[PDB]
Amino acid sequence: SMSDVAIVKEGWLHKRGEYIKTWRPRYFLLKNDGTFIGYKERPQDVDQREAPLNNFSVAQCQLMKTERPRPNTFIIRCLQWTTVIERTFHVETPEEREEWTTAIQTVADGLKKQEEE
Ligand SMILES: O=P(O)(O)O[C@H]1[C@H](O)[C@@H](OP(=O)(O)O)[C@H](OP(=O)(O)O)[C@@H](OP(=O)(O)O)[C@H]1O
Numbered sequence: 309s310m311s312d313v314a315i316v317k318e319g320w321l322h323k324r325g326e327y328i329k330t331w332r333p334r335y336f337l338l339k340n341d342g343t344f345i346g347y348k349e350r351p352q353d354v355d356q357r358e359a360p361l362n363n364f365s366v367a368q369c370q371l372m373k374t375e376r377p378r379p380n381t382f383i384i385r386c387l388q389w390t391t392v393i394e395r396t397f398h399v400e401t402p403e404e405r406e407e408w409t410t411a412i413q414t415v416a417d418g419l420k421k422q423e424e425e
Pocket residue numbers: 323324325326327328329332334361362363395
């Protein structure tokens with residue numbers, strides 16, 4: 309129960325709009341249960357933590373590193389209920405991008421092992 313809701317990684321990033329393709333600052337949190345949740349403002353209490361702006365599930369996701377429109381961009385391709393979606397993120401260094409993509413992959417891998425077991 310409690311290990312599943314551990315926060316694996318959290319931090320600020322920029323998230324690109326889907327239609328108005330600007331880079332928007334968002335605070336994201338990844339948990340062991342595959343939830344990847346974003347906030348406009350970094351939450352400062354539990355009520356704020358419980359009301360994210362963005363909410364994705366990283367189970368079986370694909371993780372793509374790209375250099376356009378900016379270096380150090382990454383794309384997650386994931387399933388949102390029954391629709392495949394892509395979301396685009398940016399951080400300031402390739403090392404930080406690797407930290408995020410590896411963290412997400414590690415969580416996805418743990419979920420697949422749970423399924424197998
Ligand atoms: O603002 P524009 O460019 O019009 O497009 C919006 C933003 O990309 C939203 O992200 P953000 O909330 O981070 O601004 C996104 O929410 P999610 O990424 O949470 O899905 C919306 O998807 P919808 O969820 O389909 O509304 C999408 O339609």
